[model samples]
Target chain A: DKALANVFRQMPVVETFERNKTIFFPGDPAERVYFLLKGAVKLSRVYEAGEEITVALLRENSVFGVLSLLTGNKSDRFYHAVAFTPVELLSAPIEQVEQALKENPELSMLMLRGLSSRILQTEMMIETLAHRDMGSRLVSFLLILCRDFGVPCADGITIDLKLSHQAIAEAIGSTRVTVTRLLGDLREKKMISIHKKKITVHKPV
Target chain B: DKALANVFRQMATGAFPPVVETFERNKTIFFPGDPAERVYFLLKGAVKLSRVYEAGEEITVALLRENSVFGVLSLLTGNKSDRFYHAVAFTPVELLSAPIEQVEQALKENPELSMLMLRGLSSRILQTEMMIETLAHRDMGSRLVSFLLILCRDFGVPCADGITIDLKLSHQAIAEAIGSTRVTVTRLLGDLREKKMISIHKKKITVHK
Candidate 1:
């Protein structure tokens, strides 16, 4: 618990944001490293053709705006970060974070841990995008959500996040109509069950 | 240059000297969920990072080379994080590994090391995103071309006819990397050869002018 508190102390104070708010858009100057204190943030890349592909979803304790770490204190945000849910975040200027890392060895470890998490998360996102077919891509994305934020219940594993068809469509780079049709097909095949914007994947036989 | 040498000198010695470990080709360095207590720097040869799904399917995520740093997921929080990918020596590999505490201590003394580590990892992450873009292409033939261009940039060595990809890779591995079947990769490779776009000798590929 002391370690956790130390990590909390390293960053700046929290700023609360409501759901659906755009935290930072592409090309925004990345001056601070933001830590999610609560809720989820969706990070996506905007294509030249103006399409957004959701690359990652960050829950509590996830870190973003780390371009400062890669660049030498001067960089622009490459991904668009938006609040997927009401969020509390601690934003520390890159200078302060660097000073903290220089002063505290353990704090450096924590930062490294956060960066490693970003790499792994992006790799998993690549796996999600690797699926060529829309159906496979949707299934891959659902499986990732299940791994990241699933809650075990009576029937099977249910994703804790309440995601709408539109949200799912945005996340997987598909249309809401297509997501609806595909989800209906999955439900018809008894592969999954949905209620109240929550989805549960039945145990595979 | 001095800063880099200083950082290198500190990491190789100082409070803790990292042990140089060697693994034969195809050997498993660490499995998913293993405690990530130490970080590794590739000294020689190549390493492959793969993710294994719950359904028992494995996919290659990143193929790394010398000077790449990895396994930095170790943190102060107890059991909150562990190795997420299966690390294997893609070729006979040499590694320099030190405990996370030691690396952390090094970072405190020389902030340069931390930035170096961050830069290395960020480059890897960008490469991962590039692979995502490669997979985003709908056509398999376009995907293969994109992958070849990427390979040529990353691992190509200048030769007589064109740039030869230095790594010896099988058709099956290419298929796995591109999310296609081996037979399809073989057929596509044959097509590329017929079109005089690329030449293959042994298991290595060379892209023509």
Candidate 2:
């Protein structure tokens, strides 16, 4: 669609890079916006005491470094965007991106839609943290993985990614112990198997 | 800007009219003691639902997303809002306003829209229930897992290779969303990456399963 295509065209081209490369550092005055062409990115912050938190994760075709773009505010959160693997990206001067949106109403609407979807997803995360058991939560997480990044293989749905029990805790607003216990139960039920950090799910098992 | 002005103009011409306008994060949309006569549809940004104790401190109840309807509690009960609703913008936002009377009229005239509203409200209730349960018993890891799972199930896009999402969120924003400290989120994320349960590419995180 031209709507999305126009958005992409307005952005500047950037080269591919290895994982853990910083896109925007914390406390830097924001000047540009970024769009992911390939790979995933994590947005996180570190406290004064050196405690860090993972806030948002952007995947392919998603926009990042937007807080500074939207309000002209200095990036409040430490935006350390690291690639999990080799990735491609597009960057745009914030002023240019804003100008494009101002010139094209459709583009603005599309951008708004993208932002709206993010808000909706964040709201869902908040709600999930408030409810659901560890087992049910794990099941739901497995189902979500299958839908978002799962590969349908002969065995079942292959989830080939690395996740720690702690990350799961942060997402659902729970503890590591609960997640570990739930995983054990799921494995015992023969519903799921984990090998080399890859989780495979067999439906109706 | 003309874009902002145009949004306001469209909202003005809509069936319901806006009562106030502001550009501050965490501004009160409606207070606990105020009369509720309208519902709001977020045209941009985010809002938080919260309750205040007599001591005057606020405990955030929920965070609302753009395009979502809010302020139904007061309307349904015909009472003042039990909690103070602060329409904070995590980002710059626009909103569409509709009076309660007008909304009721629409419901009477369009049964399907009313049904849709009911469905939305029902789903929200379910989401709230799930949140309460997770907080009560689950560990933080499981909670985070549950959050990701819900995102994929609710809003994931199907691609040729994998399902994808484009949420440009920060860890601090996430910490607030999940009622945890940012440090906890980070440590766990690192652990997850080490375990290969998920992978990060720039600002995006993708789950393998």
Candidate 3:
């Protein structure tokens, strides 16, 4: 809402990052919270053995980095946040955000709303990853994308992002070769189509 | 650290005396579409948080231990939104809970309590991410290993042989946690035992690595 945007706009800084830039990396001191004003951000976490998994792909209006605010201590971030697209964010110090929430109940509600959705979205990501079958996992990921990023088209619903097979593979935890082969099979089965790196899913006939 | 603990120590007295309640094992604490009217903190026993798919199949999303918090979502968005997660008692459980209005007042009046709620949500986020990483393992064997390691992180107790998980576990629960079948879990446990990677006694498992 315009009112909510206005409330956030009053925060200290309006910052921007170029596409594919690391906004914050693992082990960084989480000192500030960010509100995405425009573009996309990808959050990932690294396993002990060095495998990286995409935990969440956030669009505009997402709130992040509040873990530092809540801990009220000097805690390092446990995940990586990178700009998936050229991004604009509203940044504020933790103390300011905390004071605002204390003084404005509505602001606290807004923060709570953001944190709740973040928790749910990450849990849904867990569900998608929990599928034992890779194909099923891919399908679940697509359905989640459809729910979050799909746009209606003449044919059906088209996922609006231009993503490489590698991107899809990384998002779904598969090799590019496997994703390409499976995508071709799905195309043959009329389940989906990819053109210009954008995928459109067809409904059941 | 003392200051932090001192601030949190006041949670159960004065301004925030939560209603203490108990539930039988397997009792449905709340369901999908229910109103999220209160915040719950587990005092004892385990709680299973799960999601119900459109096909009516239920999948476990989290196995919350003691000191975990839940049901604060409605406090933020108001009761206008329906609950999406189903909560059940994994064991006969005791809980400390407060209505959203009371919690909201406490949070507003006490910055320390607000910070505590934030810390609660922070752990849930981290725990869910840990689950995501566990499920990302391509093989069931690896997936089960990953989950046990996480459990070892949270519930492990050091013993002579190795670190023991301090809770009772069944094949069905393990299977559901990793999205595998109970039969598969039993076979995997046998394989792990034969390999001497883990040992089980009286339904408790100890990992040796």
Candidate 4:
């Protein structure tokens, strides 16, 4: 990740946002790409019945707000973004990102890495949704979170994301009530534990 | 579509012209631990982009057809480790292969090529998302229908009664592609046939027009 960590050393600008703040609205023009230097960002769109479904929870080292390589006039964005925590961002106008890529073709390859990761992540989401039961879906999602963002702790391997049952439900294409019950079942089975809003999975023997 | 076809024209004519390579049926193009050196453009026949997990289970992530690109992960991650998917020729296949360096150079020298690449990646993202929508369907019958409909729309050949799947996929293969079992696939295919929604001839399946 160090190589990836260095791609934005020359991004030319930094922006900070407070926790629970809207970073960009759905219709806002796509101008700049924001690289997460610290904290977390959430990408979500309005779902059924006036609820905003969290599409993805992006943490440190993730990039967002990129329609950078797109040409011609585009529409109002399809989704809005918010800061889940007080966040630090390295922001660069899309033109700057393009210019930098032109100046250095290596950046193009790096950008491709990000784009490829996006594709792989989307496919994994599809795979998770293919599971037949709510428990199965929750189980798959827990495994994914732990793999991608787990932090080792004395208790177990923590997901390292501040996720609530609602957020988990939104992500896994399940209901909040269903996720809560499944989490309770997993907790009873000693497969996972949720403490202080952090979900962690217990290692198998 | 015309623009995209034009973009890949360079792949066949650039200084480093793409060479057409043929593979025997079911031959591995690359596996999980192989070097990521070349990207391929499928010119003829079917190829599968899939993964074999540590537990020996296989899943078909994508069924690629003529005029599709694959093996692009190498250039992206810079061969940081072994490749992620095990690409194999699903049938006897012909593909145009190019090294990373030449592809990179073509991309830099040509804006149209880069745009085409971007568009391709964007399309892949959209396809994956659509797969998610289809997978979210609860029952196997509906799931299989959605999956087949997608294939029929994207990769089918129209005939007198309906649209015939261009590829000859076994029921087991269809089951694996959708994360179902062979027994369940057989039952569902029978149900679809009873409803006059589909017909099976040999290994090829047809969806009614």
Candidate 5:
């Protein structure tokens, strides 16, 4: 696609044999933009007591190193982009992305829409945390997963993504034990079924 | 001068009581739509609620009915106006205004109305939070449910038949209130009807059990 190619052409490609690369460390100056071309990347930061907060899990097509590009804010968070599999990346300095945006008005509009959608999702997460009970929040998360990555099957919606219990707990701001308990409850109610990394929703309740 | 005089004449004729002696059309009842100036009591018809955005979008915020006070947020937040409101008289609305200073003085002078206003604002805030929550998380089905519940709590007038909501708000207006696309809302309404949750006739939607 022209759009994909444009993005690729704008950035410099880098190939790494290193399995786990610390692309941007916490409190490091946020200077470079990274476009993942191959393999998965996890964006995480460590707290003062060294507890890690996994801010985002990025796929091959996802972009990372974007905070500084957008707001010129210092990288208050750490980013350790480990290649879950082997990885290739397109690296652009923050100034390059800024220049590209200034030059291409259409691209700017696209970026704006993307940023707005991200903000909307974040706001929704905040609202869920503030208002919804734990059960409702878990249900909502399952619904979102179904919407985003559901694979159609005879049963209904199948979420084929692999998510560790800890990851789900971090994403929903809950404890791992809580997530496990809730998932067990959902399974008992026949609302959902889980097998290894796969989760299947039989119907919309 | 004519508009001010008309407002004064209306106040004198008991259109608005002792406080609001004058007003001007398209004139801001309070600048910055700030809650700091005073609490405005709607005596007659309707006032257009609006907030101006940085993007130059003059979003119509809400429509206040008679016997309601604007600037409740100002009293709670202890801040100036967070949004600008343009008071447009839909059917020549009248207002009784009381300065913030006067209201504070009155609160010291008399606690009952002060307590009443505080309760009213608290309730309004809870309703707003619920609205925001529904808008953020729920799908159209749950959003409609939440909206109906709010209507019943806030404006439903009890009758032997059922509770009646008198506002004749258009679907487009409702869409703005709930932050959804018009087409999405229209389809959702159809879905609600098929499920027998509501009955829609023209511009009116009535919840039925």
Candidate 6:
């Protein structure tokens, strides 16, 4: 994002949001794109029956919501954004952003790189999500979180974000009961530890 | 797609331009690990992209419809697609293609067109991830619900009950889409019909609210 941040920070639509607040709902007019300056942002879509699924998490310096190229120039599905932690964001009008890409090839290339990286990430998500067993899927999910977002601890690695079993279930297509039972088993076997809100994987393979 | 089809048709009037080729159903358009030498635009019909990882079930990656593009992965400079990629004609297909090198050169010269292609590729990736999410469900119930939701969005027709999808996706093919057994699909569909959530008649499904 080093390449894109400079471009984003130059825009005039900087804003900050408190934790657990809605940034946009499914049918909100699709006008602006946002860049996360600090803290975490979660993108999610809910089922008609009220079950919510985590789609992607945006960390500091990450961006979410591209002006989609659909026929209506409007969103056809439920894509909601929330601040997982207190977050600062920069935004630019969709028109301004579109003009920038059309005018600057270098800017467009940076965007392409961003899009390519996102594509690769989604593909990896598919790989993990396609696991037939919840055990394998949860293991793969933890290992990846440890690799990408965790900090090293004396015992192992700890993810800084506090997550409930229910949240983990939604992320990995499992249920809270199942995730809680699995974590308890892992803790008993010395494979992982959950202290308060922190989840630490012991010498995570 | 009709708009783009006209472009290809217009180009075929000359020599060394986009050539429209026909492939029979079930024909292998490319095999795993083959060099990504050309870019193709599907003029009609469907192509199925699939992959098998070293330690996972065989995943039916995506079903590319008419006007879709494939082999664009080869254009990315450092993608280094060491893994295998396979495609087959899911239906009888007519396509227009050009050498990868030629397309690459043209894209390099025109930033707008390159950006458009990049956007197209991104859209494809998004669609693939959606399909993967469908395959992620472990049970037939979740899998079928997700599949039906997508169908409702993409192919549904308004009706008095709810949405009706007329596409003829057989029970066998539905099983393949969700990686389940055919018997299970039939039984589950029967249950849905009995529950008054869906009505199936003459191969069309009506999803009732």
Say which candidate scores most in DockQ: 3
Interface root-mean-square deviation, each candidate: 3.1, 11.9, 2.6, 3.3, 17.4, 2.8
lDDT of 3 at A127: 71
What does candidate 5's lDDT look like per residue over A84-146, in tens digits? 335678777777776765564444423322332232333234333333466766776666566
Candidates in order: C-alpha RMSD to true structure: 4.5, 16.7, 3.9, 5.1, 19.8, 4.4
Best by lDDT: 3
B1-209 per-residue lDDT for model 2 (tens digits): 56445434444434545554444553456776566667776656655555443335443444455545676544444344343444445434567667766655554434334434443353343334334333433466765665555444544556544445345445665565455678887877788779887666665567766
TM-score for the first chain in candidate 1 comes to: 0.86
Candidate 6 residues lying further than 4 Å off, grouped into runs, are A6-11, A16-19, A47-51, A59-61, A67-77, A131-133, A150-166, A173-177, A193-205, B5-19, B51-54, B98-100, B136-138, B148-172, B189-209
Please list, in the order the candidates appear, how each scores on TM-score for chain B only: 0.80, 0.66, 0.83, 0.79, 0.60, 0.76
What is the lDDT of every predicted structure here? 0.74, 0.56, 0.76, 0.70, 0.54, 0.70
Docking class of 4: acceptable
Error of 6 at B166 (Å): 6.2
B42-140 in candidate 3: lDDT tens per residue?
Answer: 878878778776545676767777778887766766454567778888767898887766776666645456546766777777677777888788799
For model 2 chain A, the run of ten residues with the poorest summed lDDT: A119-128
DockQ of 3: 0.49
TM-score of 2: 0.49
- TM-score of every candidate relative to the true structure: 0.77, 0.49, 0.84, 0.74, 0.43, 0.77
- lDDT of model 5 at position A63: 60
List the candidate 4 regions with Cα displacement exceeding 4 Å: A1-34, A37-57, A65-107, B1-17, B24-28, B33-37, B54-56, B78-81, B90-92, B99-120, B157-164, B199-209
Please give me the total number of clashing residue pairs in predicted model 1: 0
lDDT of 5 by residue, B90-205 (tens): 33457777555555444442323443443333233223333443443345666556555555555555644455454454555455555566787788878877977777555456
Candidate 1 lDDT, B30-142, residue by residue in tens: 89978777888887877777777666666667767677777764542345356767888866789888888787677664545765776777766766665766677668887
Off by over 4 Å in 2: A1-3, A45-51, A75-77, A127-143, A153-155, A160-185, A195-197, B1-8, B12-96, B99-209
Could you tell me the interface RMSD of model 4?
3.3
